Subunit: 86 residues, 6 copies
Amino acid sequence: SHMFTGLNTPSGVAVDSAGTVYVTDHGNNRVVKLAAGSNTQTVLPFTGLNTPHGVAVDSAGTVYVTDHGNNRVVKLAAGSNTQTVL
Amino acid sequence: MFTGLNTPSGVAVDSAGTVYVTDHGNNRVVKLAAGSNTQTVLPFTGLNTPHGVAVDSAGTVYVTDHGNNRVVKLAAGSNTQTVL
Amino acid sequence: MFTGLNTPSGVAVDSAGTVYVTDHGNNRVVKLAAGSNTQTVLPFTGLNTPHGVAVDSAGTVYVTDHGNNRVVKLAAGSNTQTVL
Amino acid sequence: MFTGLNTPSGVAVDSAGTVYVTDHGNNRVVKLAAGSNTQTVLPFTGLNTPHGVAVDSAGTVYVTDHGNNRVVKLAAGSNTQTVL
Amino acid sequence: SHMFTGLNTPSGVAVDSAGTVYVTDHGNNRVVKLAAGSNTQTVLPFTGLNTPHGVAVDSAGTVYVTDHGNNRVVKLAAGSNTQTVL
Amino acid sequence: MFTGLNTPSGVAVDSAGTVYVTDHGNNRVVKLAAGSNTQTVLPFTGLNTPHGVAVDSAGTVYVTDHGNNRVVKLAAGSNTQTVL
Ligand SMILES: [Cl-]
Ligand SMILES: [Cl-]
Ligand SMILES: [Cl-]
Ligand SMILES: [Cl-]
Ligand SMILES: [Cl-]
Ligand SMILES: [Cl-]
Ligand SMILES: [Cl-]
Ligand SMILES: [Cl-]
Ligand SMILES: [Cl-]
Ligand SMILES: [Cl-]
Ligand SMILES: [Cl-]
Ligand SMILES: [Cl-]
């Protein structure tokens, strides 16, 4: 327990079939994820964000985020370093 | 690709890969079907700022209507919303 | 079927069709089972504005506790939350 | 000096130095006079999430009632609001 | 009383020395104002807005608004039809 | 001109025409002095999402710190914040 660090007004949350939790850390302009049982979060490599607000994850582990200040939606496949703008 | 969004807020994705977004600054809910580049507006009515969205295994879409203090839902292929 | 909501924000639906809403202006999380007609207030404690909600296949509820800079989880049969 | 705030949103200050805050997660508006050490909850009624606040030179308080799609006002010596 | 019309999740509010009330009608992508005693609002001619969130008015009646989805602040002088981007 | 803002939220203006903005997506409060094209960051500390801002006749700046459930203030030319 108490394993996310440095959160600031988290907004969106999603959970996948492995129990990994995805959060839009809305005050910090980033999307973080925490595997089940894990002590250390991962910060997803979305680029160019202006306040991520909502997040969803599909059955293939693709992460979709609303980029509130950029009027767009972005997506990252599981383990990818290269987002796609929807 | 989504076009003309304004301060999108909520996002959901169904078992087929369709993406649903609450276009929170534009008073509407939009989707983008997997297999398609054409966004569609869902026929919700009477909205005052849709804020969050969810989709169930049957394709039913559930939206928080922030300014009406209610949750609205549309079944897959229905144009008739139900209020929860 | 939901009652007394105030600027609901987040919404999630599980595989049973239970709908979960963050009743953001009232500092609480509510759920309504598919086919039920009374809501249940989930026994989260110490919230400062639940904002978003998700639910896993086992019915564990995850909520962003916006003003406490934290994510809380509650198993469906539990009255004791865990902080993530 | 403010107590029990939950995701405060709006803030205003008048010519007397009284500070007014929309205590947005608790569905209420609070004020603290310059040099005082207890807050007063303003007697607005029927709010669904006060979001923004302003105050005129006569001390009349204006609040956006986000979930009721309305603006409410309360004179400093009054217990009865007006809807704009 | 009950003189604003068509509001949708109003957010920001401001009041000037004439008692005119200014509101960001955040769900409708517009800024409205209502003079004291008046039965009919005015809609200010800001352009290109992506969700106005906050509003202020100065002692000269110049209106300043945060354009949340455009990552900017805009201003309109009293009676003007031509905003300035700050 | 303001530069590098992210989802600005609150705005205030003082008797001199200085404009104060809560740069809500960037965890900071900025101002732009009348007579100047150079924005400055106010030395608030410990912020978790500043949401609203007000300024009094003495130039004191008051900010709602949304994620810390508090209001912070800075006197004109002070770098030492006080918590209300
Ligand atoms: Cl928010
Ligand atoms: Cl936001
Ligand atoms: Cl928002
Ligand atoms: Cl909203
Ligand atoms: Cl909100
Ligand atoms: Cl919020
Ligand atoms: Cl908010
Ligand atoms: Cl709100
Ligand atoms: Cl909002
Ligand atoms: Cl907003
Ligand atoms: Cl916001
Ligand atoms: Cl916020």
